[PDB]
Write a protein that binds this ligand. Structure first.
Ligand SMILES: [Ca+2]
Ligand SMILES: [Ca+2]
Ligand SMILES: [Mn+2]
Ligand SMILES: [Mn+2]
Lengths: 180, 46, 181, 47
């Protein structure tokens, strides 16, 4: 047994157990990944590496994370690009911006990525996103082209409560989003 | 309003034994503020 | 509200959530601070900073830590210098070795130290240790001279279980070590 | 059974920074011993 847990109910000005990358910073009780500014990237990582599986034993961890987030666009139609929760190698740095959400670099499978991300994508990129052109939740492993998507209707400026959980006994990753 | 998505993803296959977890957001020509208001995490490796 | 928690029941050969300073390393599922070898120091820190109090509100955290440790000496008589659980600044580096336990540099209060430690001290240092000469548990704030001490009889090679707890409401720091049987 | 206990009032905020790292330290000198830890649990909560 190895366990790691934390909770931050309100982000303070010097949130030292977080690593910030790009424009990510903390302002007024909140972690802001992005300002409503064009062409930026921001990421924030928990300070400790977490042991997600063990090669000796073959064991994989059970985990659960929940967060509430807000996307605040100037209006409901001009919205880009999206936000991710991701699991990457300990030394992860920002990857390609824009449509790649700061976590991937291509739509083709790249084993070198070693990143799994749950995306909340607010912009339809013709090259890889759902043909319906709708805003969506997706599960990404080693590619920006999701293995599965669900259409989601963005509520501009409202707080969304998300739960993501992984069950090692069946390997099912579950994501739930609720605007309360 | 609620949205749920489920997928078998065998994590052992794609990610290293030790990982860092976090949030990412980007803007393009069109943009939005992306903010997180609270975060809870727990994991257990037997 | 901020909480930080973790547990490590078996240490592995690449415990990436610890920072090792000095000779600290992990071996046969245990965290090894020193081997039975002369004149060395080993430290290990949890890698995340922990928010222990807040200046805006003045609130202080409540916390508990528990651990099992083993001191294994060549015999019951020749044993030095001891072991500490400590709370230090995020950039803490090893301080003086020997009877200072890798954590302090003086017998006098040193405000720049900013560390409190609970020591399990196995060697009587005439200069600051309880004159009775017994091994002891002590609470150290910014000094190797404990503000408070309790004699402890060391059981060589045996597992001790300790719980350190801080209650923010009373500012009481409680330390319990128990030997099985 | 054997148990040893120690309690003291220590106003931590007078002595440590707001942010801290916690850990273990052990030393040897002319006389020595192995200092090992078998398990570790920690929990803190700041209201
Ligand atoms: Ca997109
Ligand atoms: Ca001593
Ligand atoms: Mn997408
Ligand atoms: Mn002492």
């Amino acid at each position: 047994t190895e366990t790691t847990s934390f909770s931050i109910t309100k982000f303070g000005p010097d949130q030292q157990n977080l690593i910030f990358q790009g424009d990510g910073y903390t302002t007024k009780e909140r972690l802001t990944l992005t300002k409503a500014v064009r062409n930026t990237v921001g990421r924030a990582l928990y300070s400790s590496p977490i042991h997600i599986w063990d090669s000796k034993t073959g064991n994989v961890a059970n985990f659960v994370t929940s967060f509430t987030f807000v996307i605040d666009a100037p209006n409901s139609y001009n919205v880009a690009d999206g936000f991710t929760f991701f699991i990457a190698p300990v030394d992860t740095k920002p990857q390609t911006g824009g449509g790649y959400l700061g976590v991937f670099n291509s739509k083709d499978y790249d084993k070198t990525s070693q990143t799994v991300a749950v995306e909340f994508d607010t912009f339809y990129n013709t090259a890889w996103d759902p043909s319906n052109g709708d805003r969506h939740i997706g599960i990404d492993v080693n590619s920006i082209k999701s293995i599965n998507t669900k259409s989601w209707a963005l509520q501009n400026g409202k707080e969304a409560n998300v739960v993501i959980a992984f069950n090692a006994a069946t390997n099912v990753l579950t994501v739930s989003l609720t605007y309360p | 309003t609620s949205y749920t998505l489920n997928e078998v993803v065998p994590l052992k296959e794609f990610v290293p034994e030790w990982v860092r977890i976090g949030f990412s957001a980007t803007t393009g020509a069109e943009f939005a503020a992306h903010e997180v208001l609270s975060w809870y995490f727990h994991s257990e490796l037997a």
